[PDB]
């Protein structure tokens, strides 16, 4: 009982501190900045060959190679520049929920309800792609495992617990705990010394990879958090809640800077990413289209329609050249 | 140029990949996928004697292959990994009949599954296991349905009942009452997009495979008829 009163007092004090910190508003500060304009990105490619719904994809470091995964149980390495199946990998378990591309471009990972995301070698001397390491130890289903280095990999499973592994030994080296609900997505920092995660408890947390402990928490969403991406300078980030609204957060100020929501949109979000310049914010809704938001003004910059079914994943190349979006119709469409 | 050799190798690799992928797609279309469900310790892992997310089964009937999955490793929370089965042939639902206390939870879970947005267009083959146990409990009379369901006091056996030889009127009435209670949720509002196929099975039943075969044939035929607009 006393602990409850202490927690309530601490929460009230934190809220008062944030309220005192707030002085102005982003729209008022940036009101004097002109609109970007109605952008009309037109499809430049269409990638075909995946039988079932597509859940996740990842760009390579060179902005020319990327990987996709679908429920049918196949891993395909495409080539956006020239549409070709560079490699095809059939998974042991037909169920998969995420895919990753090592920054070195020599390894990929993918996992799902099997509670494991394994390691595939793409620089085989024998020439045949084979699984090198499978990491076991997670309790719930694996929601997302993103690469950190050729030997370090991060993960977030269905048991409300992220994990930093070491493939050469395949042993959990640090455990991130403290999340009430399920963990959906994470986004590493460009400095690769931190990473923020979203969970199905209307909250997001910031960790320290070396020290392994939550550093801060943010709560401004009514429903679960599906996607989380990092601002390229590592001083802000935005999330897409299922409540049909996207918000922008700051680490230094530690408040919800701005929100993106209109009356005409009432569907849930599934993916989020930031354009290289940082002025454009992309959101993939549940009504079979993606929306482009003027990040610093929170006004509809434009629409990106032309998907038969739900748009699950989304991403922007490293150089901010091409945008790739996968959907439930089993098609990947690249936008200039 | 001397760089188009890489293009030739790329074309050869792409051709091989497509050639294999065609066979893979053919097989994947050929196979039929089913999702198993039901409360724990309810004959879920033993509905089929196996005479043919984590757990999968492979049984073939009349040169037709069926793929049934048993999600039995994940946590209790369900509203997120359930969506990964929105394109299955049908969902198998198994619910025990002699546990009046968990029966209400079974009704609520089934209703939520029926109303789920992303599963709005999937039919379910409903099962009702432990009929012998229900008969034993009814004959014993220690408990009573009325102590849980007040509406049962004003229920009567349907005129279309097909009782098994010697089936007591009391046990038959209870069975069909539970069946109607299940069916009411589905028939409430579905718009004809999907339906249910209630059954009366037991732990000793060995013909469940035939029943699911007939049910899946019927539903696929109904889908083929819905296309072409009847």
């Amino acid at each position, epitope marked *: 009982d006393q602990l409850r009163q202490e927690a309530e007092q601490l929460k009230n004090q934190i809220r008062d501190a944030r309220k005192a910190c707030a002085d102005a508003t982003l729209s008022q500060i940036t009101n004097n900045i002109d609109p970007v304009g109605r952008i009309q990105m037109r499809t430049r490619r269409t990638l075909r060959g995946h039988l079932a719904k597509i859940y996740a994809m990842h760009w390579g470091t060179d902005s020319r190679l990327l990987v996709s995964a679908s429920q049918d149980g196949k891993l395909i390495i495409w080539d956006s520049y020239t549409t070709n199946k560079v490699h095809a990998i059939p998974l042991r378990s037909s169920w998969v929920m995420t895919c990753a591309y090592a920054p070195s471009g020599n390894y990929v990972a993918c996992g799902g309800l099997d509670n494991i995301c394994s390691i595939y070698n793409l620089k085989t001397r024998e020439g045949n792609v084979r699984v090198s390491r499978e990491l076991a130890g997670h309790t719930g289903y694996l929601s997302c495992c993103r690469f950190l280095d050729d030997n370090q990999i991060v993960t977030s499973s269905g048991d409300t617990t992220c994990a930093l592994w070491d493939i050469e030994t395949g042993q959990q080296t640090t455990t991130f705990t403290g999340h009430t609900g399920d963990v959906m997505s994470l986004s590493l920092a460009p400095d690769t010394r931190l990473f923020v995660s979203g969970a*199905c408890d209307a909250s997001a947390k910031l960790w320290d990879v070396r020290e392994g402990m939550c550093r801060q928490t943010f709560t401004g969403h009514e429903s679960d958090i599906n996607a989380i991406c990092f601002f390229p300078n590592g001083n802000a980030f935005a999330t897409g809640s299922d409540d049909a609204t996207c918000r922008l957060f700051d680490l230094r100020a530690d408040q919800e800077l701005m929100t993106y929501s209109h009356d005409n949109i009432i569907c849930g979000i599934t993916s989020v990413s930031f354009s290289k310049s940082g002025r454009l914010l992309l959101a993939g809704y549940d009504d079979f289209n993606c929306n482009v938001w003027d990040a610093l003004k929170a006004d509809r910059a434009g629409v990106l329609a032309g998907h038969d079914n739900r748009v699950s994943c989304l991403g922007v190349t490293d150089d901010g050249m091409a945008v790739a979006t996968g959907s439930w119709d089993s098609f990947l469409k690249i936008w200039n | 140029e001397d760089q188009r050799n890489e293009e030739k190798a790329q074309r050869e690799a792409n051709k091989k990949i497509e050639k294999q992928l065609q066979k893979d797609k053919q097989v994947y279309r050929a196979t039929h996928r089913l999702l198993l469900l039901g409360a724990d310790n309810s004959g879920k892992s033993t509905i089929v004697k196996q005479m043919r997310g984590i757990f999968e089964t492979k049984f073939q009937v009349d040169k037709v292959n069926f793929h049934m999955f048993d999600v039995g490793g994940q946590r209790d*929370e369900r*509203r997120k990994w359930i969506q990964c089965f929105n394109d299955v042939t049908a969902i198998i639902f198994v619910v025990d009949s002699s546990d009046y206390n968990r029966l209400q939870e079974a009704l609520n*879970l089934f209703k939520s599954i029926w109303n789920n*947005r992303w599963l709005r267009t999937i039919s379910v083959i409903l099962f009702l296991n432990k009929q012998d146990l229900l008969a034993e409990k009814v004959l014993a009379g220690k408990s009573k349905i009325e102590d849980y369901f*007040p509406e049962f006091a004003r229920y009567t056996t349907p005129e279309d009942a097909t009782p098994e030889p010697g089936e007591d009127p009391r046990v038959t009435r209870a069975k069909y009452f539970i069946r109607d209670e299940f069916l009411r949720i589905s028939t409430a509002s579905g718009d004809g997009r999907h339906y249910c196929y209630p059954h009366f099975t037991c732990a000793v039943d060995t013909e469940n495979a035939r029943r699911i075969f007939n049910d899946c044939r019927d539903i696929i035929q109904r889908m083929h008829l819905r296309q072409y607009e009847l």
Partner: nanobody, 128 residues
Framework: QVQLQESGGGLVQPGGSLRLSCAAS????????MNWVRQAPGKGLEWVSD????????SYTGSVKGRFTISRDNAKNTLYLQMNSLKPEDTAVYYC?????????????????????RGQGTQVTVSS
């Protein structure tokens, strides 16, 4: 930010009246479907009642049919559940659970001591 405080409740003789309230804040109250869920001592959770967006659709469990009333008020961000004629086995922790999806009526919110948007509780016991 999501908070659900459940006031009311107390010791009452068998067959007496009562009233329970679930104060909520941090979200648009009118865009969610509310439920009451109880956990009898030495047992798991279980559904009790529910209510639709504007209060049109209502439902109840078997044992409370006709003995409990659920009332909602969106203009104040509060939700009541009037209780009348309670029996000895009515004693249990009561919660005010909201499932996440707005503008839908389908959800799984009786998780085994793991749900996130569930009120902390409001103890009510019946004694002689």
């Amino acid at each position: 930010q999501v908070q659900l405080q459940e006031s009311g409740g107390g010791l009452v003789q068998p067959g007496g009246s009562l009233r329970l309230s679930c104060a909520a804040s941090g979200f648009t109250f009118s865009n969610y479907k509310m439920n009451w869920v109880r956990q009898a001592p030495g047992k798991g959770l279980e559904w009790v009642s529910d209510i639709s967006q504007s209060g049109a659709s209502i439902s109840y469990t078997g044992s409370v049919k006709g003995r409990f009333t659920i009332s909602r008020d969106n203009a104040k961000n509060t939700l009541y559940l009037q209780m009348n004629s309670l029996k000895p086995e009515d004693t249990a922790v009561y919660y005010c659970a909201r499932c996440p999806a707005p503008f839908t009526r389908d959800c799984f919110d009786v998780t085994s001591t793991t749900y996130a948007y569930r009120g902390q509780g409001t103890q009510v016991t019946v004694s002689s």
